[PDB]
Structure formats: structure tokens, C-alpha cells
Amino acid sequence: FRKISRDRGIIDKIISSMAPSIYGHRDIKTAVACSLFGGVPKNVNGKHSIRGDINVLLLGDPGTAKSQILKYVEKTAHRAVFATGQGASAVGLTAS
Amino acid sequence: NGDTNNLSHQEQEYLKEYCDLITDLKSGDLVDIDLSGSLVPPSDVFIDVRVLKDAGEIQTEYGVFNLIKDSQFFVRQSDVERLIQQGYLQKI
Amino acid sequence: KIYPKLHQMDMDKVSRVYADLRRESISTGSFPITVRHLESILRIAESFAKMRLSEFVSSYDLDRAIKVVVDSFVDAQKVSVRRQLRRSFAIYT
Amino acid sequence: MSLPAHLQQTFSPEEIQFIVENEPIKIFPRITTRQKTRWQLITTDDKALNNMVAMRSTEVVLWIALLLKQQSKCSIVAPQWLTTKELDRKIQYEKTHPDRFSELPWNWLVLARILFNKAKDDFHDPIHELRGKIQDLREIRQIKVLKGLKYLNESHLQLDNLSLLEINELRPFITEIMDKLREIHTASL
Amino acid sequence: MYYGISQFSEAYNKILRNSSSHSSCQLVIFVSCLNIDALCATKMLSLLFKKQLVQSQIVPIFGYSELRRHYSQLDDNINSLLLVGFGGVIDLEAFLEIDPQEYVIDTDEKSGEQSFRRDIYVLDAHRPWNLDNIFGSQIIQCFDDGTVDDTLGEQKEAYYKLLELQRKKQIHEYEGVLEEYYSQGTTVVNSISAQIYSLLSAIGETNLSNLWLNILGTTSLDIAYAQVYNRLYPLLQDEVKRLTPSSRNSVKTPDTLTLNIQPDYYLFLLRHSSLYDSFYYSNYVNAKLSLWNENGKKRLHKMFARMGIPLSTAQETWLYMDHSIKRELGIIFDKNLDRYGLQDIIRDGFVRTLGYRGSISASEFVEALTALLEVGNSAQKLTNLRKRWVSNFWLSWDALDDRKVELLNRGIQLAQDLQRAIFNTGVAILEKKLIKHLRIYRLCVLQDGPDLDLYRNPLTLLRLGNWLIECCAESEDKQLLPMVLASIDENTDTYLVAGLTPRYPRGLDTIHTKKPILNNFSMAFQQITAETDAKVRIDNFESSIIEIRREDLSPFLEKLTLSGLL
Amino acid sequence: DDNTEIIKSFKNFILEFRLDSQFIYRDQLRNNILVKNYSLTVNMEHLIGYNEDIYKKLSDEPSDIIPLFETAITQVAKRISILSLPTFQLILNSNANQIPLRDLDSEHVSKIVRLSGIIISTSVLSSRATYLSIMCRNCRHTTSITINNFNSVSLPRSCLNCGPDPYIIIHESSKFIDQQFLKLQEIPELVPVGEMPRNLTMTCDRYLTNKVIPGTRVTIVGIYSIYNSVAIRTPYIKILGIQSDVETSSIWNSVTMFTEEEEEEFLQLSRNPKLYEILTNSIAPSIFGNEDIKKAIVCLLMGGSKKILPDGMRLRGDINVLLLGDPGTAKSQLLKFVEKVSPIAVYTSGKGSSAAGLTASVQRDPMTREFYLEGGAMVLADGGVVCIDEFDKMRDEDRVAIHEAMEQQTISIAKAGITTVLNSRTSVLAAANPIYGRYDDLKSPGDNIDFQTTILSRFDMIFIVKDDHNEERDISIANHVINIHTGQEENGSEISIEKMKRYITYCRLKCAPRLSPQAAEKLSSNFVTIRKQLLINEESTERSSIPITIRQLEAIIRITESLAKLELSPIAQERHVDEAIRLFQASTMDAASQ
Ligand SMILES: Nc1ncnc2c1ncn2[C@@H]1O[C@H](COP(=O)(O)OP(=O)(O)OP(=O)(O)O)[C@@H](O)[C@H]1O
Ligand SMILES: Nc1ncnc2c1ncn2[C@@H]1O[C@H](COP(=O)(O)OP(=O)(O)O)[C@@H](O)[C@H]1O
Ligand SMILES: [Mg+2]
Ligand SMILES: [Mg+2]
Ligand SMILES: [Zn+2]
Numbered sequence A: 001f002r003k004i005s006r007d008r009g010i011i012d013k014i015i016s017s018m019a020p021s022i023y024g025h026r027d028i029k030t031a032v033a034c035s036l037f038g039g040v041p042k043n044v045n046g047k048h049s050i051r052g053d054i055n056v057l058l059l060g061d062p063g064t065a066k067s068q069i070l071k072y073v074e075k076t077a078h079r080a081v082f083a084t085g086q087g088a089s090a091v092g093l094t095a096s
Numbered sequence B: 001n002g003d004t005n006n007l008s009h010q011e012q013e014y015l016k017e018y019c020d021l022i023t024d025l026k027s028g029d030l031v032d033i034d035l036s037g038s039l040v041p042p043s044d045v046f047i048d049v050r051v052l053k054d055a056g057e058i059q060t061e062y063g064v065f066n067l068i069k070d071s072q073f074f075v076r077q078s079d080v081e082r083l084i085q086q087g088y089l090q091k092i
Numbered sequence C: 001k002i003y004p005k006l007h008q009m010d011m012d013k014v015s016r017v018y019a020d021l022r023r024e025s026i027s028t029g030s031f032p033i034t035v036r037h038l039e040s041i042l043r044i045a046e047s048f049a050k051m052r053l054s055e056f057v058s059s060y061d062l063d064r065a066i067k068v069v070v071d072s073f074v075d076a077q078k079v080s081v082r083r084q085l086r087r088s089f090a091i092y093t
Numbered sequence D: 001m002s003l004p005a006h007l008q009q010t011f012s013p014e015e016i017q018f019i020v021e022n023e024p025i026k027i028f029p030r031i032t033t034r035q036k037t038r039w040q041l042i043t044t045d046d047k048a049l050n051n052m053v054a055m056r057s058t059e060v061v062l063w064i065a066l067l068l069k070q071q072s073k074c075s076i077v078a079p080q081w082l083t084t085k086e087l088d089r090k091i092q093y094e095k096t097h098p099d100r101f102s103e104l105p106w107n108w109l110v111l112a113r114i115l116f117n118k119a120k121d122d123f124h125d126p127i128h129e130l131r132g133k134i135q136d137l138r139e140i141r142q143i144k145v146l147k148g149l150k151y152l153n154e155s156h157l158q159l160d161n162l163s164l165l166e167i168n169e170l171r172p173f174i175t176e177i178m179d180k181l182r183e184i185h186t187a188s189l
Numbered sequence E: 001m002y003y004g005i006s007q008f009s010e011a012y013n014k015i016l017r018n019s020s021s022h023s024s025c026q027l028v029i030f031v032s033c034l035n036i037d038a039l040c041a042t043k044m045l046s047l048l049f050k051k052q053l054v055q056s057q058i059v060p061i062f063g064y065s066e067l068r069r070h071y072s073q074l075d076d077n078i079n080s081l082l083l084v085g086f087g088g089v090i091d092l093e094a095f096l097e098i099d100p101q102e103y104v105i106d107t108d109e110k111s112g113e114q115s116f117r118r119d120i121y122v123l124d125a126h127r128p129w130n131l132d133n134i135f136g137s138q139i140i141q142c143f144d145d146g147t148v149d150d151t152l153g154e155q156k157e158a159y160y161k162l163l164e165l166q167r168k169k170q171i172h173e174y175e176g177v178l179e180e181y182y183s184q185g186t187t188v189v190n191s192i193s194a195q196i197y198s199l200l201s202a203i204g205e206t207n208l209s210n211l212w213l214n215i216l217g218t219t220s221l222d223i224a225y226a227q228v229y230n231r232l233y234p235l236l237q238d239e240v241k242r243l244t245p246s247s248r249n250s251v252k253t254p255d256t257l258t259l260n261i262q263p264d265y266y267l268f269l270l271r272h273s274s275l276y277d278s279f280y281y282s283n284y285v286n287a288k289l290s291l292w293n294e295n296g297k298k299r300l301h302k303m304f305a306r307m308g309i310p311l312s313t314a315q316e317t318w319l320y321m322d323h324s325i326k327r328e329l330g331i332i333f334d335k336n337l338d339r340y341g342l343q344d345i346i347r348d349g350f351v352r353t354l355g356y357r358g359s360i361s362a363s364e365f366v367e368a369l370t371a372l373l374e375v376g377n378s379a380q381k382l383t384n385l386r387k388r389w390v391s392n393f394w395l396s397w398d399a400l401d402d403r404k405v406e407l408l409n410r411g412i413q414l415a416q417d418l419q420r421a422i423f424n425t426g427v428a429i430l431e432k433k434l435i436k437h438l439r440i441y442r443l444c445v446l447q448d449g450p451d452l453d454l455y456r457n458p459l460t461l462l463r464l465g466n467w468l469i470e471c472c473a474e475s476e477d478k479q480l481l482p483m484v485l486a487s488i489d490e491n492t493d494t495y496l497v498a499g500l501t502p503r504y505p506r507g508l509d510t511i512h513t514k515k516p517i518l519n520n521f522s523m524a525f526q527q528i529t530a531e532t533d534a535k536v537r538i539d540n541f542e543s544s545i546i547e548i549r550r551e552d553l554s555p556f557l558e559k560l561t562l563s564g565l566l
Numbered sequence F: 001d002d003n004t005e006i007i008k009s010f011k012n013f014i015l016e017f018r019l020d021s022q023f024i025y026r027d028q029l030r031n032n033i034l035v036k037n038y039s040l041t042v043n044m045e046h047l048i049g050y051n052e053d054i055y056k057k058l059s060d061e062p063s064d065i066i067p068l069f070e071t072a073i074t075q076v077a078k079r080i081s082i083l084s085l086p087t088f089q090l091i092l093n094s095n096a097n098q099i100p101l102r103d104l105d106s107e108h109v110s111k112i113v114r115l116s117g118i119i120i121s122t123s124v125l126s127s128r129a130t131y132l133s134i135m136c137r138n139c140r141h142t143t144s145i146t147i148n149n150f151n152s153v154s155l156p157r158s159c160l161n162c163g164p165d166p167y168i169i170i171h172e173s174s175k176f177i178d179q180q181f182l183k184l185q186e187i188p189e190l191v192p193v194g195e196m197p198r199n200l201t202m203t204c205d206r207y208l209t210n211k212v213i214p215g216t217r218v219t220i221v222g223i224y225s226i227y228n229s230v231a232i233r234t235p236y237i238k239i240l241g242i243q244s245d246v247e248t249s250s251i252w253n254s255v256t257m258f259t260e261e262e263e264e265e266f267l268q269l270s271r272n273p274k275l276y277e278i279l280t281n282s283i284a285p286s287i288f289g290n291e292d293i294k295k296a297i298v299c300l301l302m303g304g305s306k307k308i309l310p311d312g313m314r315l316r317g318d319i320n321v322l323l324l325g326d327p328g329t330a331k332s333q334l335l336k337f338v339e340k341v342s343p344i345a346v347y348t349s350g351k352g353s354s355a356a357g358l359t360a361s362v363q364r365d366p367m368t369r370e371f372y373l374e375g376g377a378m379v380l381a382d383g384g385v386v387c388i389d390e391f392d393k394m395r396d397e398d399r400v401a402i403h404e405a406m407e408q409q410t411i412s413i414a415k416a417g418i419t420t421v422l423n424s425r426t427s428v429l430a431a432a433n434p435i436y437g438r439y440d441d442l443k444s445p446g447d448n449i450d451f452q453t454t455i456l457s458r459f460d461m462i463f464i465v466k467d468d469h470n471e472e473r474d475i476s477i478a479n480h481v482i483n484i485h486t487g488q489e490e491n492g493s494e495i496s497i498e499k500m501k502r503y504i505t506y507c508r509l510k511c512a513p514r515l516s517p518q519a520a521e522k523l524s525s526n527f528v529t530i531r532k533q534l535l536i537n538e539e540s541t542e543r544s545s546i547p548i549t550i551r552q553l554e555a556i557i558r559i560t561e562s563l564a565k566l567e568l569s570p571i572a573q574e575r576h577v578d579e580a581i582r583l584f585q586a587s588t589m590d591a592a593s594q
Helices: A002-006 A010-016 A026-037 A067-076 B009-026 B081-086 C011-025 C035-051 C059-075 C079-091 D013-020 D062-070 D084-096 D108-118 D127-151 D164-188 E008-018 E036-051 E063-072 E131-136 E147-151 E153-164 E167-182 E192-203 E208-219 E226-243 E275-280 E283-289 E294-307 E311-315 E323-336 E362-375 E379-399 E405-432 E452-456 E458-470 E521-531 E553-563 F002-016 F024-034 F044-050 F052-060 F062-081 F248-252 F260-270 F275-282 F291-302 F331-341 F396-407 F453-458 F471-486 F497-510 F517-537 F550-566 F574-593
Strands: A042-044 A048-050 B046-051 B057-059 B064-066 B072-076 B089-091 D024-029 D058-061 D074-076 E027-032 E056-061 E080-084 E104-108 E113-116 E119-123 E140-143 E257-265 E346-354 E359-361 E442-445 E483-486 E494-500 E545-549 F039-043 F089-093 F112-122 F126-136 F142-146 F167-185 F199-205 F217-227 F234-244 F321-325 F345-349 F360-364 F371-375 F385-389 F410-415 F418-423 F427-432 F461-465
Touching (some): A010 A026, A026 A067, A026 C035, A026 C059, A048 F331, B072 E036, B081 B089, C011 C035, C011 C079, C011 F471, C059 C079, D013 D108, D058 D062, D062 D074, D062 D108, D084 D127, D108 D164, D127 F024, E008 E119, E008 E192, E056 E063, E056 E379, E131 E140, E131 E153, E147 E153, E153 E167, E192 E226, E208 E257, E208 E362, E226 E257, E275 E311, E283 E294, E283 E458, E359 E362, E362 E379, E362 E405, E379 E405, E405 E452, E405 E458, E458 E494, E483 E553, E494 E553, F002 F024, F002 F052, F024 F039, F112 F234, F260 F497, F275 F550, F291 F331, F291 F427, F291 F461, F291 F497, F321 F331, F331 F427, F331 F497, F371 F418, F461 F574, F517 F550, F517 F574
Parallel strands (some): E027 E056, E080 E119, E442 E483, F039 F089, F089 F234, F321 F427, F321 F461, F385 F427
Antiparallel strands (some): B046 B072, B057 B064, D024 D058, E104 E113, E483 E494, F112 F167, F112 F217, F126 F142, F126 F167, F360 F371
């Protein structure tokens, strides 16, 4: 991992490796990679809490390979949960 | 030894006259004693003091003390008692 | 195992980008812009730094995050004003 | 006014110490002042200081003794009552008689504190043992004081052999309570 | 003139004779504000003068400008002046505008000597001595440790012949030898507290408190000048043996005071933190394991696992750690430290205990004092900062008393925090590879750190410099090179450049390691400042630390590289 | 044998310890005995310093060694107090590393551990047996038993012919002590990934009872023991010492606990000529601007004064604040900070709330089959602040349950045969968004607010925060946030959270100012002017959605009284009236005019 990281073009390879079976959408792959890696949460002096996660939304045409991208993200992420529109309740999410 | 806006005019005049009376009392046969002095019995002849507020080379009756802030003296309590009273020095 | 930090960064660049984004987003019906998106720019810079297992965010990562956010904002606009928006924001991207 | 409120009707501990340091004490001079300048004091006697010989018992004032001790020019001879055996005897006397107080010196607490702080190497016995004995004596006397405080009345009251520091500590409460009881009784008539 | 080792008693008697009158005070002591050794020496002197009822004033001082100001402000009733911790290298007569004629009182033709109202005593451990103060001047008296008689006979002869004067060739030879003597750098040769203790032993006022202060003063030099500490250690051992009661069978009492030579360790605050923290925040351990990256942490975890100490147990505080492991620690270290190259952690130190209180070692006490000195709590801001440091001096002074233990605990906590901050800064420096390597010297410049404010104090900068010197430089088998460390403060827009001498690998006795390494940066900095025009400040007592304007650092470093006198 | 030696060692430690010239524990024991406080607090560092062997013995077998220490303490107390007294209690203090609540396992069985958590439930005091008097049924043999509360005891199985278990306890001659049960949860920040918070059963005795209230973080020192309710044991904690950051004794009693050194620190702070600015700057230091909202939060924290009239009528003294604004205004962060700083506070989400959640719930006991009442956020946050985030998300049904709580400060329950009136004296700080997510100036205010006037009238101050895109303010906020991300005045311009909380408690428990006649006259004039302006501002198309009733006059009076209380001033003058009027104009009239 260290040897791979030392390479200059590591970010480009990482982006290209996101869902290799999807032809293009290099803007939906970059966002997915950024969300997967995420940010660093911060707690300033113990009083201020700042979120350290990245949320992504895909608003597109019916056949532009969005569900496949979500499935790939589910496979790659360490802990992932998949839910459908109407298949999810207000307390099925969150806690009940 | 011998703000005012809270006081009334009568109280201010009373305070001035009382200070004058105290000075007159100190000017009498009790000149050797300093009536307006410390009421804590003397315990140690020599003490360590520390300068709290910067001031020039103030020439006291006992001697000349160049009160540089943050500087310690090993002197007699009697000599620097007044300076401690006014807050220039500290016993520590 | 990686928690990157920001120590050297162009404050003026990010501030100007945020101000320009707000000014262009004042338009009715546009994509909302708030301090959340400045924090998102910083978060994306942190993520890009993390992708290299680097312990400190570099200027290149911040520039890439700025480009990503500005490109998304530009693409979110309408056809008529997209050309003007892209020309205006060409400096950052 | 001229006198603060906390110095009214009572003495502060510093005043009690000042009173105590006027009493005599025995010392061993480490210099020879006697001839075979001259002290000229106006509050105490200066004959003893002038006729001082090395390693010969002499009597001087406690504050002068402490001043000499600071210069390591005299070793203070501790009081006889400040021995472990004598303190143990006093503790036994206190325990056997729950109604009276032991005949300790009127300045035992103040003198003990002064000597412990200023003259630590002069004592023949370990300091910690003396501290423990003094603490035990103090607690026993405190128990006796608490038991005896239940008899406050409009008439007189007797507290024999009670030391100066304890009387100074108890003066406010005892005096005020007895004054109020006397006031109530006088109003009753 | 100078006083030999045996003349300390005579100098003390002279001070007693002149500056002693209950009517008024006539003794003033000037102390370096940011030197622990000077602090301890002045504490010893203060106690000694309190014993004899000598009226005195103690004035902390930072830099030569403040020395000049305070000396100009001195009264005429000061018969004797004490310069503790500085003044050896500079010409006090020339610097202070002291004209002997205006200071004389009486002159006797028969005696051939002149009496002066004011006398100046110099207690400086730095070298080389300024021959003007040693062999030329009479008002300036220097407390020499024997160096002048041991090695300065030839320079003495040369200077005397120069004063006494075909003759051009002889003058050339004498001035050449004088210049060669003056061309060397500056180092520390001895501890001033050791000289004060020698004086006390001469006049027979040595006790356990004086010995403790001497130990603290001597061990303050262990971090930088280990050769001096090694030279002075046997005497401290012998003195501790002499002053310790023969019988220790008596049970502990509330007033018992112990001073033992117990095995100490090159760990950071072992007795007031956790063992894991002690190994983590130690300069030597980090140098020998590279704890600034993940590999070092993994190696430390592996070491702790092989020693048999659970990670939870190791992170437990010292007081509540399992007693079996605490008792076995010596054996455990004896058998396991050699594997990871930490064989040098084993050492013998001085540990002081009070009845029913915790035990603290000399190194931990010095660390607490230094932490209190550092973080305890245009020209106007500089003056305010130096005033704050002068104030911190008194917190450090108070911490030396046994009644003020809360100050010592606060200093320990501040030391922990400061070490954590320095570790973070060093991690940032090393990860970014900011240490540029030039053939003549190394360079490291801080510009946008997270804790830049902490490094305005010279002591914190020196701490960071030592951390960096031990780590990745003392090791790696790299040729010794002086290091340049610079920091920036935005509130004033100026730099704080500090030259640092290289160090040999710790605990490696060798003929070349026996020889010392001199600090030549003062001479080069002075020459560059005189030749260049950048408004540089050399007012600090430690001549290697200077303040540089924001713009001029690049030309200054160019000239430094081109000079080749480092 | 060995027990006597252990007792002697403990007695020697008590009677011989000293760090300078005061016997700390001897004097402490005497002082405690003087005020009928039969206990003794021992710092474990001192025990380690005196003798490490004693500490080793105590740590090895706490359940068997602590009773000996209590016996030694009792003997020393009898020696020191009686001139020739139940068993004394030992309370321990330690600085050992805190073990996470979830890390407690088999390895920590029967050992002294330190941990911190949140108390979620407390039980009713029970009665334990210490001295039992027993008698045999057949031969009537009198006997006694002495019981210690530390569990590794029963009535004799054989008399001293008599059948098994022949002894019967005589009650009138026995002595009992107090016992309580607590439920301790783990801190939310310490919970592992994707796990529910864990509960732990704990017990306290005698002087450690009635020391904590539900919802307060505490630190506990105790023994990790087990009790058999077949191859398993139920874990529990035997409390030996409780340390909390909230003075619960001074909250539930009119009595106030503050050291003389504290009282004089809070007086000096109050004497500061500009304490208002310091407190305004001390709230949400990481949030830029919003000065008026910070002042409103200060007023809400301080609160007003409550008056009970001779006729029985009671007047509310709590201040409620509503924040209706656009996204990114930092309302939720302000709510979180308020929850953090207030002595008592509960942070709740409107979405994730219910009618029974936020008031009280009828719950049936599984065993007794009897119905009891549990408490909700407005009972758990009694005497504090309730931060109702996402106020708009709340269902109507749920919402409607809040009215009496806010106004009458009581909860009325008539369910499952339970008829009671609970007490809920709380302040509500709510945040919400408009109907469309932004305050569209094109549409009327009525269309931007779905809140009925009844709920809105109860809020003393309503803040309509609109995000305006100004280049200068945007640049300033960006710079502030960047400095926050990349990055301690404490020079009298700001005080930490702990000091502010303590000062709030002191001010609430100490001062309750009153209005002067000039203040009343000015307030009446302003109320008349405001009502006249509202009447004028009305348009024929719609009636004012933001109301102005007598409740607003009461709210302004409360704000003035809180401002006066801020400085510990017994009387409120026109100077505070002006500030209260300015705040009302800046928030409520500002919302209404639009
Ligand atoms: N003035 C400010 N200073 C600092 N941070 C700010 C400021 N304004 C907004 N933020 C940040 O913007 C983010 C907004 O999230 P927050 O939950 O606080 O918003 P909100 O006002 O409650 O909005 P919403 O109605 O969408 O829930 C937070 O990270 C907050 O830190
Ligand atoms: N860019 C693309 N590259 C490769 N395959 C694609 C691409 N876009 C669509 N497809 C194919 O078309 C199908 C799209 O279905 P899906 O993406 O699941 O529908 P939706 O986009 O509504 O989620 C997928 O089975 C995928 O294989
Ligand atoms: Mg789909
Ligand atoms: Mg929100
Ligand atoms: Zn029977």
C-alpha cells in the first residue's frame, strides 16, 4: 500500500478503478471515490463538532448506470446498507 | 496614612476634616509612633519582598529602593512596611 | 490509519471561490449554497489527501477539490447561462 | 474606626504569639559576651545577655532567644514539660479525670508551635512523637471543652487550667451566649 | 583579575566585609533569566546571604541591552555587583562604559593599588574567557575554575607582551596568537552550581538542600553537554554518600528526607506519567526507533509485548501500575532493551523523597523547572514578551521550595503538554522533509506550523532543536553537521534563528567523542551582521540565537553558505 | 489474627498520616463527627505514599479488606470523639485510568475500577440489615447477627430438638440502613461502532444515596462484583465513591453548596462592568455573528423570576426561544452548545419524538402487573432547558402535548387509573425551517409559517433568520470557518463552559430581581405602542400570523428580570428595560413586521 501510494498518479488510478465495467461518468466515479474515502471529523476545543463525511446525490436519466454504481459502492465499502425508495420507513432508518 | 462621586458634599467635607484631624493627632507627642501604622505584631526582622508594580527609584526615609518590577529584596520589614501597605511590594 | 490535516493553504483563494459561488447562486431556483459547501470543499481536499496516504493536505488536493465543486455547480446551471458561468469560473478550473 | 472589627473584644493569634514571646526561656550561648558593644534594652533585662558564657545555661526573652538562634549563636533548651514522658503523664492525668483539665502551661500550644517551627534540632526526642502527643492532648481537651459548654448560664463560669489560645478561640461564642442569657434573665425580672 | 578555586572563600569574605551593613542594602545580583543553572546558583547564594543577614536585591535579566539599562540605573550605594550566568565572553569594561578613574576611591603610592567603590563578580561557565576581563581589568573579578592557570599561560604571556608594547614582527606574532585564541567557538566547561557548592564547602555551609540544588544545576547540563555531567558525576556521588546517614533501618516518618542514587532511565517523566508515555515522548527512544511514523509505533508495541507488559498495564499511571511489573522493571529492561538497541536507557540518577510524599528524580525536577520557565503564567511587543519571561523566572524560583509543591505539579503538567507539542511539530517537520541539506550545514525553517507561537521563547526552540538533532541525525551514520532552526511570529514579522552544535551518538565513549565540538555560529553571525545590512539582533546572551527580519533571511543564508566559517 | 493486624495498620495510617503539620484524616474525622456525618473520604494516593503494602492488600481483596478499614475507622472515631456511633463508611478517591464501560469483563471481577457514564434510572430507597435480633421458635434463644453489606450471610440453619431454620427475626430490636439502585449507561462518544449503549446495575449505601439524578454524567469508583439471581452470574457495581460535575444537592434543595472561595469568585465576576459582553462572547465561540441570538440564549439560560400570588395564581419565569431560518444558519450547533452548557438539558429531535416520549408514559410493571409513570424529556429536563431540534417535523398530535408544559409548567395525566399533576419547569429552545425550506419574500409571512398562533404565542422571542448573500459577510464567515478548520483568549473576554455553568447555577439559586416603578411605566408605554403598531400594520387580506398578546408583555418582563439577575442586581432599572426592549424589537417585532 505504501509503495502504491508513493506513486504520483495514484489518485487517477483510484478514480479509474471505480466501477471499471461502467464506461464513462468520470464525474460520478470521482464523487464516489471521494465519498468512499471520506473526510476527517473535527472537534474544536470540545465544544464544536464538524461532520467529516461526504454525501453524494445522483440525479440523472433512467439508463445512465446509477444503480450499478450504488451496488459497486456497497460491495467496496467496509460497512454498507442498501435501501430502496418506498421500501424504507422513517424508523427503519435511524432507530425504532 | 491620613470614587468620591458616591459621597455627598457633606460626607466629602467630613472626610477631609477627619483626615486633617488624624494628621494633627500624628503631629503631637505621638510623633515617635506612627498611629496610622500596621496593627499586626512584628514577627520577623528580615523578610523577602517582591516588586508588584513598576516604579522609579523612590527615595524612602530608610533608604533608596529602585523598584524594578519582578525583583526581590531581602530587607527589614520595618523599612518597606509602607511600600507593602500601598501595594508596591509583596511579602513572598 | 490516516487522518490528514491542513496547515498550509491559500485562504484568499477559497474565500473568493466561496464568495463567487454565493453571488452566482443568489439567482432564484439555483442550487443552494451555504457554509456547508465551504466545509465540503475542505472535506473533499482532506479526502484527496487521504487517497495518497499523506498526513498533510497539499495545494494540489485543495485545487482539485475546488475544481470538483465548481464543475458540479456549473453543470447544475441552465443551458442559457452555462456558457457565461463557465467563462466566469475558468480561473479556478 | 481606629480599630478594625475583628480586633475588637478579642486578640488575634498574632497578638497571642506576641504576648507569649515576652516570657523567659533557657538557652545555651555559643559565644562569650561576658568580659574578663553592650546590650542596653529598655523593655527587658540586659544583665543576662552581657554576662553570657559559652555552653552555660542562661535566661533571656523568647524573642531575643529566637533572634540569636537564627544566627546559630545559641541552642534553645526545650521546656521540661515538652518531653515525651511528661506529655504521656499529662495524657494519663487527662484520661483519669474527665472533669478537670491538666495543669499544662498557659502557653503550651503557642510555645510548642514556635519551637517546632524554629528549633527542630534542639529537642532531645523525635519531633513526630511530640506532635502526636500534642495532637492527642488537644483532642482530649476539645472533648472536655465540648462537654463543659453545656452549662452556660446567666451567672459566672469556671474554666481552670485552660490555656490562652483555647480561651482566645472560645471567647466570642461563650461571651455572646452568656451575654444573651443574662439579657433574657434581666428582662424577665 | 580572577580568583582561583581556593580564592572563593576570600572573595566571599570580601563581599561580607564590603557589602554588609544593616543600615542599607549594598548588594545586587544580576541573573540570566533563562538558565536553570544560574537559577540554582542564585538560589544557593540567596540562602547563604540570608544566613548571614546580608541585605540584597535579585534582578532577573534577559539580554545584554537590559543589562546595560539596569547597570546604568544602579545606585551609588552598591559596593558589589554579582553577574551570575553571563558576562564571561564580553568586555564588561568596554561594554558597560566603565572608566576605572571615575570608580576609584583612594590611591596609595606605596601599595601600588587603587580602591574602587563598586566591584563586579562574574560567575560564567562559558568559554573562552575574555582576556580583557581576566588579565587586564581590576574592577572585573571572575570566578575561574582553574582554566586560566591550566591552559592560558601562553595567551597570558602574549597579552602581557602586547600591553608592554623590528618590534613589528614581535607585535605581529603576539597579535596572531591572540587572534588564534579568539577565533575558537563557545561551549560550556563547568556548572556554576558546582563552583558555588565548592565555595560553601570551603566555608563549611554544605547541607542537603545545597547538595540538592547542586545536583539540579549539574544535571541541567546533561541534555546538551554530557561530557561535563560525566566529569562532575563522581563528585556528586561521593558527596551524596558523605551527606547520607549511615543507618536506614528506621521506618519512614512524615519528616524523613531521602536522597538516594537509584537507577534512573532516559525516559520522559517516568514517575509522573505512564510507561508508554515515558517511552513514547523520549528523545532517545524516538531517535532509536523513529516513533514519528507507524513503523516506530509498531516496533514499540512489539517491544512491549515481548517484555511481557500488557498494553493496558503499560498505559496505566505510575502510581497505580501493577506492583509486580514495577518491581521487575529493572530485570525486564536488563534482558529486553538490548534487542531493540535501547541499551543506553540504563543509567544511575539521584532521586529525592519526602516523608509520605512521592519520589521525584533530578531530571524530572529540571524538566518541571524548565517547563515553568518556558510556558509559565514592534519594540513594545518585544519588551512585553521579555517582561513575561522575567515573570516566569519567579515561578521557576518559587518551584524550588518544598512548601510550593503545587507549582511543581503544575510545571510537570506543563512539561507534558510542551513535550507533546514539540513532538507534533517534529513529526510535521520530518514528514514534510523540511530539513534541507547543504554541504556546509543543515537548514530547517518553520513558516506555517500549528503552534508557531510557542517557539518565540528561545528555550522552546532549543528543545525542538535538540529533539530534531537526536532524531535522524545522531543516528543514520551521517557526518556531523551544525543545524539551523528558524521560526516566525506574525505579530512582529521577524525570525528567531538558532545555531545548534552537532552531537556524537549518546553513550559512545571514544577518543573523538572525548574531544568536544565547539559552537562557531556566533562568530559567523557577527561577521555577517557587521558586513551586511539587515538590522539583526545579537542582544541575547546565547550568541548563537539571533532575530532576523522577514526579508533578510534569504540573503543572510546565502552569505552564511558562502562564508564557510561554520 | 491477620484481621487484627490489618485493623491495627489502618488505625496507624489514620492516626499517623501528615503531609506538613496537619493530620489530615484525624482532623477530617473529627470534623465529620461534629456534624453527624459518620463517614471518611480517603485519597488512595496518600495510602500508596504511606505504605504500599496496605494498598496492595486493599486492591487484592477489596470485599474482604474494606470492612476491616471501616472497623478501624469506627474505633478511631470512638477514641477521638468519646471520653471513656454506628459503623462508619469508607469513601474512596482515585486517579486511575478510567476503563470503558464496555471493557468491563471477566478479567475485572472483584476489583476496584473507575468508570464514567450517564445515570438513566434511580430506584426508591430500600432497607438493608446491619444488626439483626433473632429468636428460636422452640426454646426461645436470643441471638444477634452483625452483617456487612459486602458480598463475596443467612439465618443459622441449626439452633443453638429444633427443626431446620428455627430462628425468627425480632424487628423492633434490629437496625437497618439505606440502599439504592442505579442504572448507568455509557457515554455516547465512547460507544463502539454500530452498537446500542450498554446498561450497568449499581448500588450505593448510606451516605452515597440521593447523590445523583437521572441524566447527569458521573464518575464512579466501585467493585465489579457478581450476584447469582446456573453457570452464570449477573454483573453489578458496588459504588464506593461518586464524583459528578453538577451540584445535585443544591439543585433539588433550596440549600446551596458553594465554597467561600467560590462565592467570592462569582461576586468578583459579577462586579465586572461588562459581564454581559463576556457571556455573549462565551457562547458558541466557533460561530460567527448571531450576536442577538447569543444574547437571547444568555437570557434563556439565566431565566426570569417566578411569582406566586396570595390567591394561588402562579406566573411563569422561564424564557422560550424559537429559531425559524434557512439552512446553514448554525441553529443546530447553537442548540447543541446550549445543551452542553446548561446545568440540566436534554437534546431531542422533533422527528424522533412522541407525545408520550416528551411528557410522561404509563408503563405496566412486568411482575406486579401495576401501572407506574416513567418520565420524558420535559420531566428529565425539569429545572433546565429542552432543545427541540427539527420543531417543524413534529406531528400535530405530538406538538399539541407541549402547550401546558410550556405555559402552566405542569403535566396532567389521567390514564390507567393514575390521576396526577407532575411538575415540568423547563425552558424550550426550538429550531425549525419554513414551509418551503427558505423564507421566500415573494409570498406572505402566513404562507411561510405553518405554525398555529397558539404555539407561537408561547415563545417569548421568535427569530426569523434569513441568509443574505453579501460579499463582505460571506468573506468574513469563510475566513472564520477556515481558521476554525486549520487551527484560547481566556483574558477576561470569555469563560470556559464549566465556570459559566457554575455561575448560571449560582445566579439562578441566588437572585430573583424585581421591576422598579419607572421600568413598569416604560414597559406599559412600549406595550401600548407595540400593540398599536401591530393593529396599524394589519392588512385586510390576512391577519397577523405572528401574535402580540399579554404573553409578550410577560416575556419582555421576564427578559428584563433575567438581565437584572445577570449582574446579581436585586432591582431591574430602565437600563435593563432598554436592552430587553431592543431584543424584543430585534427578534419578535422584526419577525412580525415582515
Ligand atoms: N456562522 C457560522 N460559523 C461557523 N460555522 C457555521 C456558521 N454557519 C454555519 N456553520 C456551519 O454550517 C453547518 C450547518 O449545519 P447546522 O446543522 O448547524 O445547520 P442548521 O442552521 O441547523 O440548518 P438546518 O435547518 O439545515 O438543519 C455546520 O457545520 C455549522 O458549523
Ligand atoms: N455507461 C455505461 N456503461 C456500461 N453499461 C451501462 C452504462 N449505462 C448503462 N449501462 C447498462 O444498462 C443498465 C442500466 O440499468 P440501471 O443503471 O440499473 O438503471 P438505473 O440507471 O435506473 O439504475 C445496466 O445493466 C448497465 O449494464
Ligand atoms: Mg435505478
Ligand atoms: Mg438543524
Ligand atoms: Zn432452638
